[PDB]
Amino acid sequence: MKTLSLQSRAKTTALKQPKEIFAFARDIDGEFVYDQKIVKDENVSYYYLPDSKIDGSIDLQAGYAKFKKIPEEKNMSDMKCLLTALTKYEQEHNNGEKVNVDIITYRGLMTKLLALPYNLNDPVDLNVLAYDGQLFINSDEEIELARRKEEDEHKQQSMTPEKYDHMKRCEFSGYKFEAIATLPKPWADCSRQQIMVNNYEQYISVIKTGIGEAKMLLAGEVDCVWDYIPEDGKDVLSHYMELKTTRILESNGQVVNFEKKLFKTWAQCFLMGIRKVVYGFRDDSFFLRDVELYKTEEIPLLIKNNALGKINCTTALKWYGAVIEWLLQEIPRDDTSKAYRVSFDPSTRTFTLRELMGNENSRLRNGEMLTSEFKQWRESI
Ligand SMILES: [Ca+2]
């Protein structure tokens, strides 16, 4: 049970340029797509939102009843599909050799670590295991499942039916916005009818990146493309976009709320190499009132210069660098007999690394994180 100081900072931010090496997707029917040409031909959305229809006429809550919601049991809580795609990549594009990184994980999990210093009320629990000279990092399914139910219970005990329903519609409005702001294909290739709202569709980019001395593989969802996907697969990340929604800023409190949202959005995009974010601003009746395009690199200065402890993107990044370095130093890379858990506890404000002693290792190495298909492949090399 080792701990890391919450004031830990890396010497420099030590940045590296990320690059996508492969992608996979879950389509609108819950099926997974792994072919590289197919996924970019059929599972990519394209940004299209005329300034004409940003006049307060569009209700982001309209059609809430026809929301196609995936049951949260099946929402990639494991690493199965990621490892399926990674296996394919190593077989077909890495000459049958393992990808050359130290860490393999999801973008969202790293965002949690990166945003931690200014979100000390949010618990973090990550399973870490060493395999084939690499660290695999995932959230814990049973913990996530239990934490998800407890948070819903709290909401039900603290919210009226009206406010609870309002929350659900806020969630829906984000997916609604993505639907009305994107096209299945470029304009020229679309019908005029095109010119279900769901959370099934997920386009997952997988990038090689890093920080400091660490080389990392991050899998992260991408909302859409700003213009086009280049054919030679070069600098593809620079064409991706992120789509977000939030309430219009009509008070100081909401500006504070937005700055905290904008910071998490920056973290999300920065780790992934996403250079563009679009925020849709809605009123209480969910009508789309305004839109704003952000360059990811301009957000840290926006936050710092805001006339409202104080969120610092550079500080957060230095903390992130210290954490990654700590994990690679404290977890033996060649011991495959153990499993570890990194945990941040809000009530004690402690950041701990510990060896799991309940034989969680057995389940993690046989389904939840490592899969039989992936292990056999790595063994065969
Ligand atoms: Ca989004």
From Swiss-Prot:
It is found in: Nucleus. Its cofactor is a divalent metal cation. It holds the Pfam family RAI1. Its EC number is 3.6.1.-. It comes from the Eukaryota. One of its GO terms (cellular component) is RNA polymerase II termination complex. One of its GO terms (biological process) is NAD-cap decapping. Keywords: Hydrolase, Metal-binding, mRNA processing, Nuclease, Nucleotide-binding, Nucleus, RNA-binding. A divalent metal cation binds at E178, D223, E242, L243. Divalent metal cation. GO terms for molecular function: enzyme regulator activity; metal ion binding; mRNA 5'-diphosphatase activity; nucleotide binding; phosphodiesterase decapping endonuclease activity; RNA binding. It catalyses: a 5'-end NAD(+)-phospho-ribonucleoside in mRNA + H2O = a 5'-end phospho-ribonucleoside in mRNA + NAD(+) + H(+); a 5'-end (N(7)-methyl 5'-triphosphoguanosine)-ribonucleoside-ribonucleotide in mRNA + H2O = a (N(7)-methyl 5'-triphosphoguanosine)-nucleoside + a 5'-end phospho-ribonucleoside in mRNA + H(+); a 5'-end triphospho-ribonucleoside in mRNA + H2O = a 5'-end phospho-ribonucleoside in mRNA + diphosphate + H(+). InterPro entries: RAI1, RAI1-like_fam. The keyword Nucleus applies. Substrate binds at Y106, R107, G108, E221, K244, Q268. Belongs to the DXO/Dom3Z family. Interacts with RAT1; the interaction is direct, stabilizes RAT1 protein structure and stimulates its exoribonuclease activity. The interaction also stimulates RAI1 pyrophosphohydrolase activity, probably by recruiting it to mRNA substrates. Decapping enzyme for NAD-capped RNAs: specifically hydrolyzes the nicotinamide adenine dinucleotide (NAD) cap from a subset of RNAs by removing the entire NAD moiety from the 5'-end of an NAD-capped RNA. The NAD-cap is present at the 5'-end of some RNAs and snoRNAs. In contrast to the canonical 5'-end N7 methylguanosine (m7G) cap, the NAD cap promotes mRNA decay. Also acts as a non-canonical decapping enzyme that removes the entire cap structure of m7G capped or incompletely capped RNAs. PANTHER family: DECAPPING AND EXORIBONUCLEASE PROTEIN (PTHR12395:SF9), DOM-3 RELATED (PTHR12395). This is Decapping nuclease RAI1. It comes from Scheffersomyces stipitis (strain ATCC 58785 / CBS 6054 / NBRC 10063 / NRRL Y-11545).
